[PDB]
């Protein structure tokens, strides 16, 4: 099942940073 | 109104003030309650402005202090030629300048250090020299030791005269403030006499002594067969045989028939094929043209005969629409503050010294200098460094003028006041430029360094790949190669073979060849521009913000040298104009260090190397610069790791001292990091515990010991950081090039 690396690697490099930094930036800037 | 005004016997000459220290200042004159008094004694010895406020007392110290400094330089210069007289191989070096290496230092047969006196050549055991004094004396037409022995005693005699002068002036005959303030007289004298007549005189020596003698020496005559200089003057038959223009005499000069002197006042502009070096006749025609220009130029100013310019009128009348009052008030600042004059003189003198180093390597002006790669490399590296230090000193005294001597009344809507009133825009854009260059100068290395590791050499910024060529410089190169004919028609050969043209070969060596500019030079030239802009940002910021900042409104009151102005407002650490100079020195060292590295690898890879009869030039490093200097690992591999083999393996040979100074230099660099990273607070608490042990055993010092001051700890570090740094590449440059 080598295709999983093609799906799980970029999720760690792109999806996880975007989602985490997106929520955090709104959380730290909340009022 | 130029006049000689003097005060008779202001200051006595007693030995009293020698004993009691701190006489110059009142705070230190009280007593040494603390060890910081010791460090403050040296830091305030030359701060004459702090000792007194009367400009007469300041200027008299400065004018006399210069004389004591000249004695040190004359003793040095006289000392160099003295070693050439007694302990040297110069007399043997002239017999064969291509097989005998130059040496003038001999270390005594004491513990293990006779090794340094290896077989340098010519039956002499001595340390090999890289200053190039041997080539200078040949340019001076010195062919025997007794001639050099006479010149050394003359310098020592001259040293006493300068030394007598500073005594005579500060103590017996002190000029008044008016004597120094007559600027218009000073500038005429230095341009005409010190530079003009000094240049005109040296033309006489070159024409009468150096050019004829060197013209016999390169021919192939023995050193003993050469007549002495006075023999040429008295016996004109010998002079006419070489340069027949002298047969006409001095009449062609006065009658404007100057073409008769074409034999020894040439404009060939190329290098002598026999001895790697410019033609003596071309150098002879140099200073004669320079002297006339300088003699004429110095008559510009008035100097008390109604004829000439007032510098105040020149500056005031250069106003404009954009600049409010133009250069009004600058003459007053420069005539009421020594630091302003010091800043201008230091900055442009340093840029001059860098400008020398670039001219000399491409246009070797001495005989057999180009073939001696060791002398050529250290000579370029030397003046490159000295110019860097002096430029940083210019920014320091520029800022010291602001805190100490700035008058807002004078600088009102002038060119300087208008500069301070938009300082934010100057730095914010320079900030943008520094970031832009650092990305697009260094990021291109990382892209190459990253791609080659990924097995993608096609995606690099290299000569086969995307290459960014320096088209602008290559265009300017071709204009110089074509200056023979057309523009500059009388010139036979270009000003330098670095721009282009044919190769020159002396013996088996190559003196100079065309320096091709490719993608590697395009990157490194931007790296230099990057590193130069940042130190300007650090230094220029200190000058503008020394008076005040948005953070600190009153920064001048604290002074030029204050550590922090408190820990609040976040943190105000290193906010002074002093600390900017401290930071700029690291960047000066960073920028300047790549320049000499750019010089070493390029000249070894592209320029220098053995040459065959068929013109095949076997370069030293084998042309590896183009495909390896584009990556950072290439420098680490091909330049540092590879060329340092001679240094580490120098043990058990004559170059062993370089391996020691090389290794020792890394220590002082790391020892610097004690003071830069740490802080005074920890060290005072450590001394507290140590003082307890002395109070226990009753070895307590009367002078209470304290840790070093804050600005001192920063000063002590950068002194080590630079000394340990420069000494490292100093030995690497020496041991590597001396072996090859």
């Amino acid at each position: 099942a080598s295709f999983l690396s093609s799906i799980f690697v970029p999720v760690i490099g792109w999806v996880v940073p975007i989602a985490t930094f997106s929520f955090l930036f709104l959380y730290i800037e909340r009022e | 109104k130029a006049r000689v005004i003097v005060d008779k016997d202001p200051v006595p000459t007693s030995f009293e003030k020698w004993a009691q220290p701190g006489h110059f200042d009142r705070t230190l004159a009280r007593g040494p309650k603390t060890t910081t008094w010791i460090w403050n004694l040296h830091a305030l010895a030359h701060d004459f402005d702090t000792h007194t406020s009367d400009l007469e007392d300041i200027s008299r110290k400065i004018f006399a202090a210069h004389f004591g400094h000249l004695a040190v330089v004359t003793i040095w210069l006289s000392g160099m030629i003295f070693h050439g007289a007694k302990f040297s191989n110069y007399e043997a070096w002239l017999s064969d300048p291509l097989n005998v290496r130059p040496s003038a230092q001999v270390v005594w047969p004491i513990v293990g250090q006779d090794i340094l006196n290896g077989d340098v050549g010519g039956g002499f055991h001595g340390i090999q020299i890289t200053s190039g004094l041997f080539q200078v004396w040949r340019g001076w037409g010195i062919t025997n030791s007794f001639q050099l022995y006479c010149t050394a005693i003359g310098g020592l005699v001259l040293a006493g005269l300068f030394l007598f002068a500073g005594w005579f002036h500060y103590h017996k005959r002190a000029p008044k403030l008016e004597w120094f303030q007559n600027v218009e007289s000073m500038l005429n004298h230095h341009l005409q006499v010190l530079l003009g007549c000094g240049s005109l005189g040296w033309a006489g020596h070159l024409i009468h002594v150096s050019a004829p003698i060197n013209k016999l020496m390169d021919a192939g005559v023995a050193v003993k067969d050469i007549p002495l200089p006075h023999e040429f003057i008295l016996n004109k038959s010998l002079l006419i045989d070489l340069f027949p223009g002298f047969a006409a005499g001095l009449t062609p000069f006065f009658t404007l028939n100057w073409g008769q002197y074409a034999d020894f006042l040439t404009f060939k502009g190329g290098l002598n094929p026999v001895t790697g070096g410019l033609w003596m006749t071309d150098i002879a025609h140099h200073h004669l043209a320079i002297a006339v220009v300088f003699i004429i130029a110095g008559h510009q100013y008035r100097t008390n005969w109604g004829i000439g310019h007032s510098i105040k009128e020149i500056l005031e009348n250069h106003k404009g629409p954009f600049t409010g009052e133009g250069h009004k008030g600058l003459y007053e600042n420069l005539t009421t503050s020594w630091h302003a004059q010091l800043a201008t003189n230091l900055a442009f003198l340093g840029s001059l010294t860098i400008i020398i180093a670039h001219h000399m390597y491409a246009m070797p002006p001495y005989p057999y200098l180009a073939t001696d790669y060791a002398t050529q490399l250290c000579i370029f590296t030397h003046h490159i460094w000295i110019g860097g230090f002096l430029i940083v000193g210019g920014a320091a005294h520029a800022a010291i003028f602001m805190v100490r001597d700035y008058d807002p009344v004078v600088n009102q809507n002038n060119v300087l006041d208008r500069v301070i009133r938009h300082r934010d825009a100057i730095i914010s854009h320079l900030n943008w430029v520094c970031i832009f260059l650092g990305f697009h100068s260094f990021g291109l290395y990382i892209h190459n360094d990253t791609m080659r590791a990924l097995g993608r050499p096609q995606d690099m910024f290299s000569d086969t790949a995307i290459q960014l060529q320096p088209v602008f410089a290559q265009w300017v190169q071709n204009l110089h190669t074509l200056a023979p004919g057309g523009t500059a028609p009388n010139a036979l050969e270009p000003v330098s073979y670095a721009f282009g043209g044919g190769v020159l070969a002396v013996g088996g060596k190559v003196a100079m060849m065309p320096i091709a500019l490719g993608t590697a030079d395009f990157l490194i030239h931007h790296i230099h521009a990057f590193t130069i802009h940042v130190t300007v940002l650090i230094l220029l910021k200190g000058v503008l913000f020394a008076r005040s900042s948005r953070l600190i409104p009153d920064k001048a009151n604290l002074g030029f040298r204050f550590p922090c102005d408190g820990p609040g407002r976040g943190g105000t650490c290193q906010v002074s104009g002093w600390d900017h100079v401290f930071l700029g020195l690291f960047w000066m060292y960073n920028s300047l260090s790549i320049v000499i590295f750019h010089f070493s690898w390029k000249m070894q890879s592209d320029v220098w190397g053995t040459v065959d009869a068929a013109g095949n030039v076997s370069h030293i490093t084998g042309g590896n610069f183009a495909q390896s200097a584009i990556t950072i690992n290439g420098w680490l591999r091909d330049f540092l790791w590879a060329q340092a083999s001679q240094v580490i393996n120098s043990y058990g040979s004559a170059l062993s001292a370089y391996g020691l100074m090389f290794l020792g230099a890394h220590f002082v660099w790391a020892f610097s990091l004690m003071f830069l990273f740490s802080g005074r607070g920890y060290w005072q608490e450590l001394i507290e515990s140590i003082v307890w042990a002395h109070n226990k055993l009753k070895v307590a010092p009367a002078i209470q010991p304290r840790a070093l001051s804050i600005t001192q700890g920063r000063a002590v570090g950068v002194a080590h950081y630079l000394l340990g740094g420069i000494a490292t590449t100093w030995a690497f440059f020496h041991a590597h090039i001396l072996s090859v």
């Binding site: - | 062609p252 009658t255 404007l256 028939n257 100057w258 073409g259 008769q260 074409a262 004429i296 008559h299 008035r302 008390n304 005969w305 109604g306 004829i307 009388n490």
Partner: protein
């Protein structure tokens, strides 16, 4: 090939002469502080440069 030089000729001296005269007329009006004692010695010197500049400059 060296530039062609100049044998002595009386025509050369008239260029030096006229060069001095234009200098005297040029300085006498425009010099801010003409008299201090002088300027005659100075203005004649400039004419020698302009003369030597014209004299050698013409014949090339």
């Amino acid at each position: 090939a060296a530039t062609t030089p100049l044998e002595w000729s009386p025509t050369v001296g008239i260029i030096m002469v006229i060069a001095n005269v234009i200098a005297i007329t040029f300085g006498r009006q425009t010099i801010k502080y003409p008299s201090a004692e002088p300027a005659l010695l100075a203005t004649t010197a400039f004419g020698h440069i302009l003369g030597v500049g014209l004299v050698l400059g013409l014949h090339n």
